Design a protein around this ligand. Structure first.
Ligand SMILES: CCCCCCCCCCCCCCCCCC(=O)OC[C@H](COP(=O)([O-])OCC(O)COP(=O)([O-])OC[C@@H](COC(=O)CCCCCCCCCCCCCCCCC)OC(=O)CCCCCCCCCCCCCCCCC)OC(=O)CCCCCCCCCCCCCCCCC
Ligand SMILES: CCCCCCCCCCCCCCCCCC(=O)OC[C@H](COP(=O)([O-])OCC(O)COP(=O)([O-])OC[C@@H](COC(=O)CCCCCCCCCCCCCCCCC)OC(=O)CCCCCCCCCCCCCCCCC)OC(=O)CCCCCCCCCCCCCCCCC
Ligand SMILES: CCCCCCCCCCCCCCCCCC(=O)OC[C@H](COP(=O)([O-])OCC[N+](C)(C)C)OC(=O)CCCCCCCCCCCCCCCCC
Ligand SMILES: CCCCCCCCCCCCCCCCCC(=O)OC[C@H](COP(=O)([O-])OCC[N+](C)(C)C)OC(=O)CCCCCCCCCCCCCCCCC
Ligand SMILES: CCCCCCCCCCCCCCCCCC(=O)OC[C@H](COP(=O)(O)OCCN)OC(=O)CCCCCCCCCCCCCCCCC
Ligand SMILES: CCCCCCCCCCCCCCCCCC(=O)OC[C@H](COP(=O)(O)OCCN)OC(=O)CCCCCCCCCCCCCCCCC
Ligand SMILES: CCCCCCCCCCCCCCCCCC(=O)OC[C@H](COP(=O)(O)OCCN)OC(=O)CCCCCCCCCCCCCCCCC
Ligand SMILES: CCCCCCCCCCCCCCCCCC(=O)OC[C@H](COP(=O)(O)OCCN)OC(=O)CCCCCCCCCCCCCCCCC
Ligand SMILES: CCCCCCCCCCCCCCCCCC(=O)OC[C@H](COP(=O)(O)OCCN)OC(=O)CCCCCCCCCCCCCCCCC
Ligand SMILES: CCCCCCCCCCCCCCCCCC(=O)OC[C@H](COP(=O)(O)OCCN)OC(=O)CCCCCCCCCCCCCCCCC
Lengths: 459, 63, 99, 173, 606
């Protein structure tokens, strides 16, 4: 994995040693080249994973997440260079450096072959994430948002450390390949109940699970645009990726320990879908839409069928591009009217024709339209959950209705109707903005032609 | 809006047209491999198990 | 007036000083170059050459191989009056049941 | 191109034309227009391509996998033996998925071919489909997402124990 | 095989090329609507060659050209089913679509975005052919949702109008409630039969099909606007008339019916399902025809007419006559599409006036729109030997002679009587009598685009039923023996309707003061279902979203029970620790306490 790690490190000196006015051009150009090389991770086999060394490996679950991770960096540099244009030069470079340091930790986190190495890099993602929110955030609440974000993660992820270390002293190893052959069934005792919760609470909080999600509306609304993209596209998938791996050593206790978390997810997604109907803040609605989509991933991972695991992998990749695109579309408005209230600027399709097309496409992939990978992932979970219990079709069906309601309520409220009379600074869309939307949607639609590369190791 | 869409289709076609011409010229003039039995005592290269010339160029060079 | 504070600066319009602006930079020359690296490496390279790379991945995860092997096995077993598939994955001769 | 034994189909039985009308048949003349305007130039262009392909012939092979000892012979926690046995089981599991897919294709093809006579003329294909689904279900069903050779074996040994207990209790009967 | 399959696929490919010529820009905008219309006409010609081969020799086939995805033992492929139902519907839909595109080149002329109008119409047609030719449920779902979205974009065409946006979103809600049933069928079929492909579903032929079928029945209810999920169809008249003539009359709305027909090998062996679809149709056909009697907007009468008709194809499905239901889809497409086009020629000539109370006097002013309106109304009511008579009267003869719910049979007959009333309601109020429209008369229908498009559908509204009826192969045993009073019951209630309607209409010209009744208000207000359900249901759901889900739970109790209480405790504990008095005397006095406790309570000295 050094062939990606070393280049990602070289982005830092490149940024710092660039001419003052070429910091964005140089970092964008070279982060795109790194993303091109990451398609070499597709060398997957039907039986074995791609095991590079004692430290790193890459199977079909981590490969799409890595490609998605390295694709978002150039898009984040595109999304950020406008509102940082007046920032002084040395803070522009520290911002790029925080984004790069995040990508370095992420790619190592998704390929770490050992669970303690995965853990250290999994909490290492907090530090750059927090600094971006609380330094370059834009409102007084960014300071409180950073605290909730920080102390929800650590409250759950310190018990995980005690659990992981206990496992290594019991099994003798935490290498994921080794754990596949040395795993032993988890007997049902009170001491194993808390081993299950310790192994899982750190990941539920990050998905996030309903109930412990309160940090996400804060963090995803107060972050600068680059922070919200990486928060929604990737960081919520560390919890899913962590769960998809650590459940290997939790059976058969997951059979009954999953019930309280399946109920929270199934009912929770209906609650968060309804919340989106009465949101006054555009960025906050898009934040709550992630909580509803990630509840499907939690249900998928916990029922543990081959179909749900394929669906969970497709949703995580599909949600990453869709939610990231919705944050950028909303930020394109914010940068004109300097507000986040949904009702403030209306009828924007009259003033920004092409940008309305981007809104339509992002809304259509969000409410899961066939054959987009957003539907494919969602359908596979709905299929596998119906087998788990036929009554689940009721709550999965009802959620499908509400998702269509708030996806088009968002589209109708902002883009349609009569324009706001007194807002007269809606300048035409910039080439930078149009290219930023098409670099989300175009790969998303292309993945429909060859979905097999985003369906995971159960494919 | 028009300018962006114009640039979008210029840069997509900038490599799309050569690649479509190149793929077409490979298929017409090189064509796909033929399935065959492994001759006795012969050990195929790992990239000799794939049908399309571009597929086995990828396997040979990168993978 | 309360502590000395800069008044909030009036927001700038990139189309005012450069009606050809792409929205990348205030410098017209850098503005153009930044658009070209994004459009070239973004669309012409990663998306187009990456799409072709994915289309011709050498038998991704052995799906094509397994189909050829299933044809080979189904042909053999049916020409020999054997069942196509067996309930037992492992030979019962090598399994010692408890008791 | 493909093997007729794996993907069998009966022989075609096309009735002979037997008109009893004076009007010309529109389909007959369109078919000859198609064989001239379409099929003919298409066949010409394909032949040119084939000529270029016969000039440069190269081959690819079907990979053969040596049999290795399976999970049952692997000593507990000997990862080197378990690794090879597991990679083999994961290949046979994928090969068995395609076998079921082959049998399903036969069933679907038979149903369409027989039309309104399908419920009686596809009784053999249905019989084959029922069995291979029964075979595949015993090996692989209810294993979960983290399926392995070890869990497959544990499932079989539970099933073998059930049959054995079932057999003896009927010996007295 | 080679001619049948090549021409059947090109028809689909031929329609997508105008969409793909919109890719590279400015190919020519001045010609685009004509280009999109000319392509539909050539697709009609090529689609007729396979339909002739099927008529001649019964040739049917399935094309699984492309393998898309294989999830373990479920191989999904792009598979097209070129069979009876698709060889007859495809040419019918292309003929009607050809007229509505020629009619739109005149009706939408002044529109600044006529190009996007024609792209959208062609996108719908592409998604409607995918639905029809689909061979597996996944591919059928793509078309199912595809028509649902192009319906949303065309209803809300005038996006600055609030009523258009509300109506467009209303259609999506009702169709997504129906889609719950579609997913339930897909989940059941995958779980129980291990397939989404229609060959396999019929080959296995489950006898326990109550759950999958009620799901398919639930999908049909929303897509075809049967009672319960019916209000979206009349509301969907907000869109331009060509949208209504095509989607919400002729083609898109019969997708719910067309789905049940595809699954007739399952519904025919399930008596419990036939009872539901029988009753569901009968209430739909009578309740909606009743609502049509008191409507005054010309587009809403035709919309409730469409609801009434779709509720009769559901009755046909309920009595185990799927093929008669299919024949009614094809015939109904001809005259119903013509009625919208005629009603759109009247609305155009009176400057967007849609109320029949400002019409009248147009019998001679618009002679050709008059003829097509009369032909269309006669075909709708089933007058003998018009295109409507070749499917409806068989349906009423097959419903009379069946072992059927007695109430459904009566409701079906009463609704057939109301059909002759609200057809007279249009000819009488729109054409006869004296003019009631403004004084500046701008009536003029002499456009060649308007006449030719109506002219083709008019011909179809006369002879299409006869030509189709006598060319398709028999698939059932028609019932031709029955009492004199069952053979003619369809014709007789239609006559009683005309007579009764004519008398009631002429009662409007007597100088007697009106006196509203409850029945009138109930019919005018659409049974109050929209007024109650489109106020109460959103109010409850939107209230709970803010009061309970958002405010009470997320902003309060979920904050209180963890971050707020945990934070509050640590603050209080901090003040107890730090609030000290800095006195040597008190600090050392605590050391003594600690030392004594260590020896007495805890015995740390042992
Ligand atoms: C579906 C077709 C939709 C096409 C479309 O037009 O939609 C956008 C269209 C936008 O146009 P508009 O709304 O009229 O407004 C005008 C535009 O803003 C601007 O219009 P304009 O006239 O000013 O400009 C021309 C046109 C086009 O301008 C362009 O030139 C941009 C097109 C670039 C295409 C790039 C694709 C390739 C990407 C690179 C990768 C290729 C690699 C290989 C290349 C080399 C080959 C080796 O503009 C646009 O289309 C702008 C959007 C372009 C991106 C949209 C996403 C593309 C896929 C759709 O909106 C819609 O049509 C609504 C779509 C609603 C969904 C309908 C279909 C749902 C059912 C699914 C159908 C079946 C799916 C497939 C499964 C089939 C199984 C049987
Ligand atoms: C549009 C953009 C996508 C296509 C761009 C690439 C085009 C490649 C197609 C090509 O060049 O094939 C050449 C084609 C293939 O020959 P082949 O030996 O049968 O194929 C070799 C393998 O068996 C099979 O070849 P393969 O395994 O390389 O398959 C390549 C694949 C191409 O797909 C790809 O792999 C390209 C992937 C790039 C991403 C595409 C995303 C685009 C999405 C945009 C939205 O082919 C397709 O599926 C495209 C066909 C449908 C379009 O050969 C020809 O040039 C002749 C075909 C046309 C003859 C028609 C008869 C006319 C003669 C009558 C007039 C004269 C009478 C006197
Ligand atoms: C309809 C009218 C007829 C037109 C037919 C044209 C059909 C189009 C041709 C076609 O299908 O292509 C063939 C194939 C699909 O069908 P195929 O697999 O059967 O291809 C046929 C060719 N062989 C036989 C060799 C396979 O195209 C593709 O597979 C495209 C794959 C693109 C996916 C990768 C996108 C690149 C993304 C790079 C990363 C950046 C984005 C960030 C990613 C985030 C995480 C993932
Ligand atoms: C102010 C906050 C209010 C929060 C309210 C939250 C509402 C919670 C609602 C609880 C009732 C829901 C149904 C419970 C299930 C009842 C039936 C059942 O089968 O399970 C009962 C279970 C059945 O379990 P069991 O008795 O069969 O256990 C088997 C033996 N072991 C566990 C060793 C393998 O009964 C119990 O839970 C025993 C009492 C335990 C008390 C709680 C322990 C702590 C739980 C929190 C863990 C984290 C600390
Ligand atoms: C395994 C399950 C895991 C999943 C469940 C997760 C549960 C959620 C846990 C999240 C942690 C609690 C939320 C903390 C949010 C940050 C605190 C905050 O924002 O409140 C502000 C409050 C006001 O004080 P202050 O900010 O200093 O005033 C500044 C004035 N401008 O600040 C304060 O008043 C001081 C707050 C200090 C407390 C910080 C949190 C420490 C958490 C560790 C508690 C350890 C308790 C040990 C005690 C044991 C003995 C009883
Ligand atoms: C908020 C409320 C939080 C309530 C939890 C507070 C912590 C209380 C302690 C939880 C019980 C964990 C425990 O002590 O298990 C001990 C057990 C002994 O280990 P050992 O003897 O070596 O193995 C034989 C098993 N008797 O050790 C084990 O066998 C497994 C230990 C697993 C590691 C657990 C890590 C902490 C678990 C608590 C956090 C998860 C709950 C979050 C909700
Ligand atoms: C909103 C806050 C967000 C954060 C969420 C925090 C959640 C923490 C969850 C901790 C508790 C997890 C449950 C563990 C309790 C111990 C379970 C136990 O000992 O019994 C296990 C038992 C095993 O025996 P078995 O044969 O499988 O079946 C018998 C059925 N009793 O089998 C079982 O009993 C299985 C069922 C036991 C669990 C019962 C579930 C309660 C009902 C669902 C409530 C949903 C969640 C409630 C959240 C309230 C929030 C305040
Ligand atoms: C273009 C390169 C044309 C080179 C043709 C001469 C080579 C040749 O004809 O050999 C046939 C070879 C397939 O035979 P093979 O089994 O791979 O044996 C390798 C030989 N040592 O085929 C090959 O040599 C593979 C070369 C063609 C495949 C790679 C082409 C680049 C991939 C992107 C294609 C896009 C179009 C290129 C332009 C952009
Ligand atoms: C013709 C095809 C042959 C290649 C030459 C391309 C060409 O003619 O120039 C096109 C382009 C300038 O055109 P354009 O970007 O549209 O102008 C600004 C907006 N009107 O200029 C180009 O296309 C040149 C490539 C633009 C991308 C610049 C970033 C790459 C810098 C060189 C390093 C690449 C290798 C790594
Ligand atoms: C339930 C299913 C739902 C499906 C949803 C699908 C959503 C995606 C959007 C619809 C896409 C429709 C496009 C269909 C036409 C393109 C088909 C194609 O890509 O042909 C490639 C084909 C590969 O052959 P195949 O065995 O099918 O490969 C399967 C590998 N997955 O290669 C060939 O066989 C021949 C290709 C060369 C053609 C030669 C003629 C060239 C003329 C140009």
């Amino acid at each position: 994995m050094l062939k990606y790690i070393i280049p990602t490190i070289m982005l830092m000196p490149l940024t710092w040693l660039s001419k003052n006015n070429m910091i964005w051009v140089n970092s964008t150009a070279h982060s795109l080249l790194i993303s091109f090389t990451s398609l070499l991770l597709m060398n997957q086999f039907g039986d074995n994973s791609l095991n590079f060394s004692l430290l790193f490996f890459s199977d079909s679950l981590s490969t799409p997440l890595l490609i998605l991770t390295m694709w978002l960096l150039p898009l984040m540099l595109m999304a950020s260079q406008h509102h940082l244009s007046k920032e002084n030069l040395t803070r522009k470079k520290l911002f790029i450096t925080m984004l790069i340091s995040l990508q370095l930790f992420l790619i190592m986190t998704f390929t770490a072959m050992e669970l303690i190495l995965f853990y250290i890099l999994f909490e290492a993602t907090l530090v750059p994430t927090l600094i971006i929110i609380t330094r370059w955030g834009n409102q007084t609440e960014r300071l409180n948002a950073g605290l909730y974000f920080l102390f929800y993660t650590l409250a759950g992820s310190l018990p995980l450390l005690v659990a992981l270390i206990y496992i290594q002293n019991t099994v003798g190893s935490l290498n994921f390949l080794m754990l596949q052959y040395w795993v032993q069934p988890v007997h049902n005792s009170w001491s194993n109940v808390f081993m299950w919760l310790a192994c899982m609470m750190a990941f539920m909080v990050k998905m996030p699970l309903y109930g412990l999600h309160l940090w996400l509306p804060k963090a995803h609304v107060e972050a600068p645009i680059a922070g919200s993209m990486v928060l929604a596209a990737v960081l919520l998938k560390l919890g899913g990726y962590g769960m998809l791996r650590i459940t290997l050593i939790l059976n058969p206790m997951t059979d009954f320990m999953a019930y309280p978390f399946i109920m929270l997810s199934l009912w929770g997604m209906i609650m968060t879908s309804s919340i989106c109907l009465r949101q006054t803040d555009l960025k906050s609605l898009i934040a709550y839409s992630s909580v509803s989509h990630m509840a499907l991933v939690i249900v998928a991972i916990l029922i543990q069928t081959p179909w749900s695991y394929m669906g969970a992998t497709a949703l995580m990749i599909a949600h990453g591009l869709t939610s990231s695109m919705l944050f950028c579309l909303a930020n394109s408005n914010y940068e004109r009217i300097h507000s986040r209230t949904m009702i403030l600027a209306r009828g924007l399709q009259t003033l920004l024709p092409l940008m309305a097309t981007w809104w339509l496409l992002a809304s259509l992939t969000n409410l899961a339209l066939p054959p987009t990978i957003n539907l494919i992932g969602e359908l596979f979970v709905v299929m596998s959950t119906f087998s788990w219990s036929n009554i689940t079709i009721i709550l999965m069906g009802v959620n499908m209705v509400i998702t269509a309601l708030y996806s088009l309520y968002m589209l109708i409220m902002t883009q349609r109707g009569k324009y706001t009379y007194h807002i007269n600074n809606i300048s035409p869309s910039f080439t930078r903005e149009n290219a930023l939307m098409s670099l989300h949607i175009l790969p998303l639609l292309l993945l429909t032609l060859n979905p097999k590369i985003i369906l995971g190791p159960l494919y | 809006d028009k300018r962006f869409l114009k640039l979008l289709r210029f840069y997509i076609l900038l490599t799309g047209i050569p690649v479509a011409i190149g793929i077409t010229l490979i298929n017409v003039f090189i064509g796909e491999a033929e399935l065959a039995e492994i001759p006795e005592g012969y050990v195929p290269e790992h990239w000799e198990y794939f049908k399309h010339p571009i597929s086995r160029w990828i396997a040979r060079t990168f993978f | 007036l309360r502590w000395q504070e800069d008044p909030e600066p009036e927001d700038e319009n990139l189309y005012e000083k450069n009606p050809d602006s792409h929205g990348y930079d205030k410098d017209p020359a850098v503005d153009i170059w930044n658009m070209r690296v994004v459009f070239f490496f973004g669309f012409s390279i990663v998306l187009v050459l990456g799409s072709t790379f994915v289309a011709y991945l050498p038998d991704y995860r052995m799906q094509e191989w397994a189909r050829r092997e299933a044809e080979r096995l189904v042909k053999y077993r049916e020409a020999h009056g054997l069942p196509i598939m067996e309930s037992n994955c492992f030979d019962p001769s090598k399994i010692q049941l408890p008791e | 191109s493909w093997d007729k034994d794996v993907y069998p189909e009966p022989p075609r039985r096309t009735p002979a034309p037997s008109p009893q009308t004076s009007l010309p048949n529109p389909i007959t003349y369109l078919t000859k227009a198609f064989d001239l305007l379409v099929d003919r130039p298409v066949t010409l262009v394909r032949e040119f391509i084939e000529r270029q392909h016969a000039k440069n012939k190269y081959y690819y092979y079907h990979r053969e996998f040596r049999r290795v000892p399976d999970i049952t012979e692997c000593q507990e926690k000997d990862v080197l033996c378990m690794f090879e046995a597991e990679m083999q089981w994961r290949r046979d599991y994928k090969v068995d998925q395609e076998i079921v897919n082959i049998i399903q294709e036969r069933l679907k093809a038979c149903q369409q071919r027989e039309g309104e006579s399908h419920r009686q003329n596809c009784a053999k294909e249905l019989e084959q489909f029922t069995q291979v689904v029964k075979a595949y279900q015993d090996r692989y069903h209810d294993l979960g997402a983290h399926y392995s050779a070890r869990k497959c074996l544990a499932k079989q040994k539970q099933r073998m124990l059930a049959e054995r207990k079932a057999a003896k209790e009927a010996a007295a009967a | 095989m080679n001619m049948f399959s090549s021409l059947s696929l090109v028809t689909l490919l031929l329609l997508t090329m105008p969409i793909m010529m919109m890719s590279f820009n400015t190919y020519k905008p001045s010609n685009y609507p004509l280009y999109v219309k000319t392509a539909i006409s050539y697709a009609f010609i090529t689609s007729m060659i396979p339909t002739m081969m099927f008529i001649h020799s019964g040739q049917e086939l399935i094309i699984s050209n492309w393998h898309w995805l294989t999830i373990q033992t479920l191989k999904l492929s792009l598979s097209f089913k070129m069979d009876y139902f698709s060889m007859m519907f495809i040419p019918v839909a292309l003929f009607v679509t050809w007229s509505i595109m020629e009619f739109s080149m005149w009706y939408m002329y002044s529109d600044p975005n006529i190009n996007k109008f024609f792209k959208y119409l062609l996108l719908f047609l592409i998604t409607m052919l995918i639905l029809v030719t689909a061979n597996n449920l996944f591919q059928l779902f793509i078309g199912w949702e595809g028509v649902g979205i192009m319906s949303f974009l065309l209803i809300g065409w005038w996006y600055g109008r609030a009523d258009a946006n509300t109506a467009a979103l209303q259609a999506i809600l009702y169709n997504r409630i129906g889609d719950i049933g579609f997913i339930l069928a897909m989940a059941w079929f995958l779980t129980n039969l291990n397939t989404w492909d229609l060959q396999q579903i019929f080959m296995l032929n489950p006898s326990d099909s109550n759950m999958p079928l009620i799901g398919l029945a639930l999908a049909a209810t929303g897509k075809s606007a049967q009672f319960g999920l019916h209000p979206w169809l009349p509301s969907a008249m907000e869109g331009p008339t060509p949208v209504s003539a095509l989607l919400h009359s002729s083609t898109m709305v019969v997708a719910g019916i067309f789905l049940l027909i595809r699954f007739y090998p399952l519904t025919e062996n399930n008596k419990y399902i036939q009872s539901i679809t029988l009753c569901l149709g009968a209430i739909t056909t009578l309740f909606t025809a009743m609502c049509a009697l008191t409507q005054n907007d010309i587009k809403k009468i035709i919309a409730f007419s469409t609801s009434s008709q779709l509720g009769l194809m559901m009755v046909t499905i309920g009595i185990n006559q799927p093929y008669l239901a299919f024949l009614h889809i094809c015939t109904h497409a001809f005259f119903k599409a013509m009625l919208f086009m005629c009603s759109g020629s009247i609305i155009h000539s009176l400057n967007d006036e849609q109320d029949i109370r400002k019409m009248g006097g147009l019998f001679k002013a618009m002679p050709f729109t008059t003829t097509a309106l009369i032909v269309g109304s006669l075909a709708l009511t089933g007058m003998p030997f018009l295109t409507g008579f070749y499917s409806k009267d068989l349906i009423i003869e097959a419903a009379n002679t069946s072992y059927t719910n007695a109430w459904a049979l009566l409701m079906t007959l009463i609704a057939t009587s109301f059909t002759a009333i609200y057809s007279t309601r249009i000819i009488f109020f729109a054409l006869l009598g004296q003019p009631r429209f403004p004084t500046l008369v701008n009536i003029n229908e002499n456009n060649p685009l308007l006449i030719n498009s109506i002219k083709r559908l008019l011909i179809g509204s006369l002879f299409a039923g006869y030509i189709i009826s006598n060319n398709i192969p028999p698939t059932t045993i028609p019932q031709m023996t029955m009492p004199y009073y069952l053979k003619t019951t369809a014709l007789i209630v239609t006559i009683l309707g005309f007579i009764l309607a004519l008398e009631i209409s002429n009662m409007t010209k007597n100088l007697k003061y009106h006196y509203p009744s409850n029945a009138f208000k109930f019919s005018t207000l659409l049974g109050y279902f929209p007024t109650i359900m489109h106020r109460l249901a959103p109010y409850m759901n939107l209230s709970m979203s803010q009061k309970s889900a958002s405010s009470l739970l997320d902003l309060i109790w979920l904050e209180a029970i963890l971050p707020k209480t945990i934070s509050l405790a640590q603050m209080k504990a901090s003040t107890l620790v730090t609030n000290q008095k800095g006195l040597i005397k008190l600090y050392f006095l605590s050391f003594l306490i600690t030392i004594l406790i260590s020896m007495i309570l805890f015995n740390f000295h042992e």
